[PDB]
């Protein structure tokens, strides 16, 4: 599968040790199938690794980052979109996961 | 004979007054700071929601 167009929209992201960030991707694809998803930014990472894409659709992925801002590059099946949002400081000072 | 009017007819903020024990009930005044450590099992993942 390959996508003709894709878009990103990140909402209420929290920089945290856990996957405190959530973002929505929208895309237009030539065909359905399992596309890989990755965060090319060295300071952000997505929980989901792959998603079954559709000729058109949108998928929401969980992500985590240390950066106070969500200005990270996301890639779906190799295409890229610049996500960006002001992530808020985490609500709980301590968490049970590195 | 000269008791005036009881507090049940005179307390402000709409306080109802109950006896035994003396207390003000359903009174409406100011704001209550509230904090609630809701059980996180009650949330649903943003991706599943």
From Swiss-Prot, chain B:
Main function: Class II viral fusion protein. Fusion activity is inactive as long as E1 is bound to E2 in mature virion. After virus attachment to target cell receptor PCDH10 and endocytosis, acidification of the endosome induce dissociation of E1/E2 heterodimer and concomitant trimerization of the E1 subunits. This E1 trimer is fusion active, and promotes release of viral nucleocapsid in cytoplasm after endosome and viral membrane fusion. Efficient fusion requires the presence of cholesterol and sphingolipid in the target membrane.
SS bonds (residue pairs): 15-27
Organism (species): Western equine encephalitis virus (WEEV)
Domain of life per record: Viruses
Protein name: Spike glycoprotein E1
Membrane topology recorded in Swiss-Prot or TrEMBL: Single-pass type I membrane protein
Localisation per UniProt entry: Virion membrane; Host cell membrane
Quaternary structure and partners: Interacts with spike glycoprotein E2. The precursor of protein E3/E2 and E1 form a heterodimer shortly after synthesis. Processing of the precursor of protein E3/E2 into E2 and E3 results in a heterodimer of the spike glycoproteins E2 and E1. Spike at virion surface are constituted of three E2-E1 heterodimers. After target cell attachment and endocytosis, E1 change conformation to form homotrimers. Interacts with 6K protein.
PTM notes: N-glycosylated.
